[PDB]
Design a protein around this ligand. Structure first.
Ligand SMILES: *[C@@H]1O[C@H](CO[C@@H]2O[C@@H](C)[C@@H](O)[C@@H](O)[C@@H]2O)[C@@H](O[C@@H]2O[C@H](CO)[C@@H](O[C@@H]3O[C@H](CO[C@H]4O[C@H](CO)[C@@H](O)[C@H](O)[C@@H]4O)[C@@H](O)[C@H](O[C@H]4O[C@H](CO)[C@@H](O)[C@H](O)[C@@H]4O)[C@@H]3O)[C@H](O)[C@H]2NC(C)=O)[C@H](O[C@@H]2O[C@@H](C)[C@@H](O)[C@@H](O)[C@@H]2O)[C@H]1NC(C)=O
Ligand SMILES: CCCCCCCC/C=C\CCCCCCCC(=O)O[C@@H](COC(=O)CCCCCCCCCCCCCCCCC)COP(=O)(O)OCCN
Ligand SMILES: *[C@@H]1O[C@H](CO[C@@H]2O[C@@H](C)[C@@H](O)[C@@H](O)[C@@H]2O)[C@@H](O[C@@H]2O[C@H](CO)[C@@H](O)[C@H](O)[C@H]2NC(C)=O)[C@H](O[C@@H]2O[C@@H](C)[C@@H](O)[C@@H](O)[C@@H]2O)[C@H]1NC(C)=O
Ligand SMILES: CCCCCCCCCCCCCCCCCCCCCCCCOC(=O)CCCCCCCCCCCCCCCCC
Ligand SMILES: [Cl-]
Ligand SMILES: [Cl-]
Ligand SMILES: [Cl-]
Ligand SMILES: [Cl-]
Ligand code: NI
Lengths: 100, 280
């Protein structure tokens, strides 16, 4: 009841990125214990207000996982990321979206 | 039939201190959510119009009431006995229970519990089996719980009598969504360079349902054994995403293609061709 597991963070788009075309940005957070977690989607370092997320679930190894997602319109210069905070992290962990 | 073949409920009960605990719960067909639990009302959330399967509204309300009493009672009892079980706060308990349809038609039921993200107990043949990871605490727990006449009987009925009929009824009721066929889309990208003079090529496959899929890097009709399948990732609205990668030397990327096979494609595979010199 003592070992904690840090979250894995994977950022991906629903559709191939086409500049100026509406898409969906996904952030899958998994492999973490305990369950309390804060997840934000960012646009140029700023928090996106309207983000949807799945209800809590866990894998057969008891690790928790969640899907966070939002509609987004990618451009050439705009940056997107997933920011996570968990008891296993001293600072928030940021994983940037990269179409390449 | 394609799609999910099992039903389970989960519980996550987070004990902050001796006077504050909260529970999250939900109902699933494999990894597709069909029930939610609303802690504001102590009732379920039916996520699909067919989420009650072939059960009457009366039977469903009876089951919601069993879960509401269980969720409240679980926290009450764990807080009352935490001292006797030498519990240190905070701690978190997980539970999963349900049943699955196997080849040959047998339905098998299961119940597992965890403490601190480690196995704590399981139910085998309507008996409480402590997990070795649970130590003497799990042995103490099983010996205490089996003396609850009402609980042992309610658990036996739910796992072995209620679950199998609910599963068959809901697999049938939801077959329009559970056995639907959704076509994937696929695209290529040039991934993070694994080292000097090496490239990583990425074949993306997204939006397919059901989950079984076949993706491979090819040179003509030759399957590249070096293809690395990523883990299947979810999309919102019951579809999946998968990356298939291949690490190659710079001058070896020409001639590669990615082939995708999926149940929805009616045998018409997707073939993508990698072209060099920034020609996509
Ligand atoms: C929700 O659906 C469940 C599944 O229904 C079936 O599947 C769906 C997808 C549709 O195709 C349905 O049309 C289809 O019925 C229902 O559960 C099933 O109900 C039937 C009765 O309708 C029941 O069949 C009976 O089985 C017993 C034998 O059972 C034992 O042995 C088998 C192995 O052989 C074993 O698997 C079992 O677990 C048991 O140990 C048999 O004696 C019965 O025969 C009697 O009735 C038939 C006519 O029905 C008659 O010809 C005979 O002569 C004799 O009188 C009968 O065949 C299934 O076993 C049961 N399946 C499961 C897994 O439980 C469910 O029905 C409700 O629960 C049932 C247990 C029963 O009490 C019903 O009356 C209830 O309505 C249904 N509704 C709900 C609310 O759950
Ligand atoms: C539409 C959706 C249909 C879903 C059907 C599918 C079935 C789901 C499958 C499995 C469910 C698993 C059962 C778990 C919860 C059962 C509630 C219950 O026990 O029964 C009780 C639980 O309440 C209590 O008695 C408080 C007990 C505290 C619990 C603490 C102990 C931890 C449990 C550990 C169990 C593991 C060991 C078991 C060994 C065997 C509730 O009832 P009831 O009729 O008195 O008072 C409801 C009348 N309205
Ligand atoms: C027992 O834990 C309560 C809940 O803890 C909060 O929620 C957890 C899920 C977790 O996120 C944790 O970090 C949170 O603090 C405490 O209540 C909270 O207390 C804080 C600080 O006083 C307050 O800001 C929160 O609003 C309050 N939350 C709730 C929902 O009540 C308990 O604190 C005691 O009770 C409070 C109501 C208040 O009277 C406070 O002074 C008390 O210490 C925790 N109790 C003990 C004995 O530690
Ligand atoms: C409508 C559909 C609506 C869908 C339903 C959603 C609601 C959620 C349903 C909840 C049921 C889940 C069933 C799984 C059963 C899980 C039980 C396993 O739990 C454990 O393993 C127990 C861990 C104990 C750790 C030690 C704690 C020490 C304190 C001692 C307490 C003793 C209590 C004695 C009684
Ligand atoms: Cl599936
Ligand atoms: Cl509740
Ligand atoms: Cl392409
Ligand atoms: Cl080989
Ligand atoms: Ni103990």
């Amino acid at each position: 009841p003592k070992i904690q597991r840090t979250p894995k963070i994977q950022v991906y788009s629903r559709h191939p990125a086409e500049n100026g075309k509406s898409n969906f940005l996904n952030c899958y957070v998994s492999g973490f214990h305990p369950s309390d977690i804060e997840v934000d989607l960012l646009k140029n370092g700023e928090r996106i207000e309207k983000v949807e997320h799945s209800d809590l679930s866990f894998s057969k190894d008891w690790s928790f996982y969640l899907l966070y997602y939002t509609e987004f319109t990618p451009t050439e210069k705009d940056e997107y990321a997933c920011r996570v905070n968990h008891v296993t992290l001293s600072q928030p962990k940021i994983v940037k979206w990269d179409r390449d | 039939f394609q799609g999910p073949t099992s039903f389970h409920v989960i519980q996550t009960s987070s004990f902050t201190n001796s006077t504050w605990a909260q529970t999250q719960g939900s109902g699933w067909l494999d990894d597709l959510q069909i029930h939610g639990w609303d802690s504001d009302s102590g009732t379920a959330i039916f996520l699909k119009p067919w989420s009650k399967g072939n059960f009457s509204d009366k039977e469903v309300a009876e089951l919601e009431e069993i879960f509401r009493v269980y969720i409240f009672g679980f926290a009450r009892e764990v807080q009352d006995f935490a001292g006797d079980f030498q519990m240190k706060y905070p701690f978190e308990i997980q539970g999963i229970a349900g049943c699955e349809l196997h080849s040959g038609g047998a339905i098998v039921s299961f119940l597992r519990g965890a403490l601190g993200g480690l196995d704590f107990l399981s139910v085998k043949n309507a008996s409480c089996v402590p997990s070795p990871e649970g130590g003497s605490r799990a042995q103490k727990f099983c010996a205490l719980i089996i003396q609850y006449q009402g609980i042992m009987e309610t658990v036996r009925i739910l796992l072995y009598e209620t679950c199998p009929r609910y599963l068959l009824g809901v697999l049938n009721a939801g077959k329009a969504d559970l056995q639907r066929q959704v076509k994937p889309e696929a695209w290529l990208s040039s991934g993070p360079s694994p080292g000097p003079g090496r490239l990583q090529l990425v074949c993306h496959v997204s939006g397919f349902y059901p989950k079984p899929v076949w993706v491979m890097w090819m040179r003509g009709e030759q399957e590249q054994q070096g293809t690395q399948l990523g883990d299947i990732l979810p999309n919102a609205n019951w579809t999946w995403y998968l990356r298939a990668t291949l690490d190659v030397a710079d001058g070896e990327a020409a001639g590669l293609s990615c082939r995708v096979k999926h149940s929805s494609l009616e045998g018409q595979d997707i073939i993508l061709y990698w072209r060099g010199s920034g020609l996509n």
